[PDB]
Design a protein around this nucleic acid. Structure first.
Lengths: 248, 253
DNA sequence: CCGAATTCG
DNA sequence: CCGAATTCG
């Protein structure tokens, strides 16, 4: 049974409002799909301890040891960990950083990366500085390994071109899949009301970039999750979760 | 010969929005205006009560207003020294603070002048728009009739960088401060170190208030001096305004 | 009326 | 945490 699946999701652990409850919901999803790899953003130590407790069949790597951070969970026995690298962005004022990881999935060498770039419009420029730094690390990544980035970019479709666009070797999976109609937005204030705001904003914050080495791994599917409201009256998060299926 | 070809003007953002100790600072400002008694006075951020009070004290001046309501700018002209030919008001099509260019055409002993004042869009956030106004002002200085002397004087809310960003001043238009070799005392018209009226703890030194100049023929009128006023805190406990008043002396053939 | 940090909507 | 409008010192 050779196949590979990942999930990226900004769970927003800063929104203490019904936090543990939303946590149990998120973990319900994670257990349901049981992907080989999971990317998370805005996670805090209690949330972390809970994740470590419940999902025990995963090796968990954190971007930080305190405050809020990102995290990469790896299914043990299915994913062997080769290394982990943490690179802080030198210009951050929000403690952000690029969390890289290198793993081995049944012979196939992988390079997984996650990040939570500088938030808000006012720091767009800074965000761009981070983005390039991310992109350059994907190409500079070993020619022998297949590179996969997945995270909360906090970007606009225009801004990506504004930075100078993707390299000819790196591609966003959403674009690669012909721009599916259902996956168009990962941050929708019309559908999600967790932050309690009266505006209609539909932005594709969470993105997955891909760089095959000849390619051995093909990205098959892309779907959203966390589309339903919990019993607490709220969604698990303001961002929608993103599952991706791949095959060898 | 009380006035030997001398000419004096005053521009000042009196800030009528700072109601804190307003009337007393107003009588102070009028104390200044009466003291120097310039031929022309440019004022910014003035409100209707302030206007009526100015009408009372400075009664030897014909007063023109940029607006009838809210806050606005005003041009006072000493009658018997200045004959008023016309007045024109041009709103910025892109303004969002009801700002506008207040032009006036007058005659001083044969020499025809075109005086202009404005209070451009405030804050850093509207810098681009501010630039749009500045050029629009500059071009109106360009478009202004030949043979006549053009003088702008107002609260530009500008930094030295922003002026260059627009493409720089036209070769015929000159900042008076720059024209005087950029004196150290006229360096700032908004200094939070020295002025504390809005009660702020920051060290901000900006030259907001500016005077632009354009003789058209060789120059017949030359700006002689440039000085600040409102340099002392009043007995009321405040400065006349957060902005420093700006007096300018000039001379003609 | 600075300018970054709340608040409002 | 959108994005334009207060607030503090």
């Amino acid at each position: 049974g050779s196949m590979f699946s990942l999930i990226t999701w900004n769970i927003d652990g800063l929104d203490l409002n019904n936090l543990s409850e939303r946590a149990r919901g998120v973990c319900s999803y994670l257990a349901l799909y049981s992907p080989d790899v999971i990317f998370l953003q805005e996670v805090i130590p209690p949330y972390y301890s809970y994740l470590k407790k419940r999902s025990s069949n995963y090796e968990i790597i954190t971007g930080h040891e305190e405050g809020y951070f990102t995290a990469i969970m790896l299914k043990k026995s299915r994913v062997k960990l080769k290394s982990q690298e943490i690179i802080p962005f030198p210009s951050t004022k929000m403690m952000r950083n690029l969390l890289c990881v290198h793993v081995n999935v049944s012979g196939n060498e992988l390079c997984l990366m996650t990040s939570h770039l500088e938030s808000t419009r006012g720091h767009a420029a800074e965000r761009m500085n981070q983005l390039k730094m991310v992109l350059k690390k994907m190409q500079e990544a070993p020619e022998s390994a297949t590179v996969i980035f997945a995270g909360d970019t906090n970007l606009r479709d225009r801004e990506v071109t504004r930075c100078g666009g993707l390299p000819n070797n790196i591609v966003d999976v959403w674009e690669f899949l012909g721009k599916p109609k259902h996956c168009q937005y990962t941050w929708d204030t019309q559908m999600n009301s967790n932050l309690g705001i009266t505006a209609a904003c539909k932005l594709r914050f969470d993105r997955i970039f891909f760089r095959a080495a000849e390619g051995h791994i093909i990205p098959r599917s892309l779907d959203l999750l966390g589309l339903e409201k919990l019993d607490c009256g709220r969604f698990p998060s303001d961002h929608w979760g993103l599952l991706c299926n791949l095959d060898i």
